[PDB]
Amino acid sequence: EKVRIYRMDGSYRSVELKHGNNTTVQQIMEGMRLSQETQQYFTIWICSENLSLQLKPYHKPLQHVRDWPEILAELTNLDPQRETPQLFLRRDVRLPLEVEKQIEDPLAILILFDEARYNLLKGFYTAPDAKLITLASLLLQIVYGNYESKKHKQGFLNEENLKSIVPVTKLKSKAPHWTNRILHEYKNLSTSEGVSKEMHHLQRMFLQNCWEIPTYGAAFFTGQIFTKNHKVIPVYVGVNIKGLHLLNMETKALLISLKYGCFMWQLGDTDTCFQIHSMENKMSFIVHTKQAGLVVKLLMKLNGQLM
Amino acid sequence: MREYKLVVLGSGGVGKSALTVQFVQGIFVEKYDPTIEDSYRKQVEVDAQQCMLEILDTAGTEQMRDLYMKNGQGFALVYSITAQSTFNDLQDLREQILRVKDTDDVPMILVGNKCDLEDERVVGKEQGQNLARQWNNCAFLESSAKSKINVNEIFYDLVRQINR
Ligand SMILES: Nc1nc2c(ncn2[C@@H]2O[C@H](COP(=O)(O)OP(=O)(O)NP(=O)(O)O)[C@@H](O)[C@H]2O)c(=O)[nH]1
Ligand SMILES: *Cc1c(O)ccc2cc(C#C)ccc12
Ligand SMILES: [Mg+2]
């Protein structure tokens, strides 16, 4: 018995299931090619198109795949016929930023790098144009190698090549005006002999620019808010080791970002919503979602980790 | 961007995974972990074009083998110059691929791995070149996953053979 454990880039590793569908996350984690250093940073997630859940070491992932239509009905209003789940190896949402900042293992770095790159291209990283251009330039070095005037000065950064290095939400309107600044920083990276060209060193540079993004490492949930005629605004709810972040589901625009200690939460009695009180703002809002129980529990655990 | 389906075949222990991981991730896998089935993706530039490579890393000790050759576009056939049996086994593989593809025009390369272990060699270089010539002048390379010798050239050459 075996299962494919995927990663964000489409790759997978098949792992033997010693105990069939009773095999645990911990057992599957052992079946990978990860040392104790590489292992502690990641865990098994179960994800379909519009629901991604971090699993626990004692969980049995194949039973979650089996029970997925019931999990979708409990936590979402989604259509279960288009949501076949798969198993992924992804960054542990509880991983403290201070721990990640001292990682030197090349395998852990590339696994984190690929997930970070996936979030950037999908539009889940909100950052100023300077930060985005810097990330795009690092991707050109990592993927296309050293800058060459013959190959990259003109007729290179078309939208086909732009897809790979800029967020999809910026491909149309803003990225085409960035191509000159991107190529300049790309040229600066290749010619600056003080910048290490080691693959894992370049991937760590990419991550360093991602660590200051507010939604970095966030687990994303789906919900709705009503606006002060009340209008419905579907939202992504991002919870990470820094706090809570609200993204417009359609544009990925950052509606609000709140650090731990600067806001409070309350789970609704109905369990299908939660309220947020922005300290030092007098502002409150309520998010309607059947994942409210998970969001609040995660908010408590990540707030409780901090010192 | 064009996608290329590449398959690394060979008997157990030859270094299929080490060669694949070195090419994709830049790491030398040291501990021997028998592979069930691993797939990798990697964007490279071959002949001034960006190519998305899907590399299938296969098990060397059991056969789903027919689906690999039905779907694969190019095939790296790997042996170890340390083990004579792994060289002897590649003959069956080369003929199985030609059978499933129903043609001898199949992108393919013969790879003699562990060329860093010279003081452990059992299969001579000339015997590898001899076999490649037998295989309708098939491409041939000696490689090492540690020393990074002829690692990228394996997958680059398959891409060119697919393009031709
Ligand atoms: N010295 C040396 N050792 C190598 C080389 N390539 C692989 N090895 C070693 O050979 C062993 C087996 O390597 P591996 O890639 O797992 O071989 P495999 O063909 O994938 N085995 P399997 O078919 O079971 O999946 C490992 O200990 C690895 O370090 C090489 O070029 N040089
Ligand atoms: C309850 C819980 C804990 O304790 C840790 C991490 C979690 C992640 C997700 C996701 C996605 C849901 C619940 C979690
Ligand atoms: Mg292997």
Author numbering:
A (entry chain A): 420 to 647, 652 to 730
B (entry chain B): 1 to 63, 67 to 167
What does the literature reporting this entry say, word for word?
The HEG1 binding domain of KRIT1 features three lysines, namely Lys475, Lys720, and Lys724; based on point mutation studies, these residues are essential for the interaction between HEG1 and KRIT1.14 The HNA was found to form a reversible imine adduct with Lys720, and SAR studies indicated that the HNA is the smallest/simplest 2-hydroxy-arylaldehyde that inhibits the HEG1-KRIT1 PPI.
To evaluate the potential of the HNA as a site-directing fragment to identify HEG1-KRIT1 PPI inhibitors with potentially improved binding affinity and inhibition activity, we synthesized and screened a series of HNA derivatives bearing substitutions at the C6 or C7 position of the naphthalene ring. The C6 and C7 positions were selected for substitutions as an analysis of the available HNA-KRIT1 co-crystal structure indicated that these two positions may provide opportunities for analogs with improved complementarity to the HEG1 binding region of KRIT1. The co-crystal structures of 3, 5, and 6 in complex with KRIT1 revealed that these compounds exhibit similar binding modes as the parent HNA fragment, including the presence of the imine adduct between the aldehyde moiety of the HNA derivative and the ε-amino group of Lys720. For example, the acetylene moiety of 3 formed a H-bond interaction with a water molecule, which, in turn, was involved in H-bond interactions with KRIT1 Phe693 and Ser471. Interestingly, the binding positions in the three crystal structures appeared nearly identical with the HNA binding pose generated in the MD simulations. This is particularly evident from the co-crystal structure with 3, where, in addition to the imine adduct with Lys720, Lys724 was found within H-bonding distance to the hydroxyl (2.87 Å), and Lys475 was within a π–cation interaction distance to the naphthalene ring (3.40 Å).
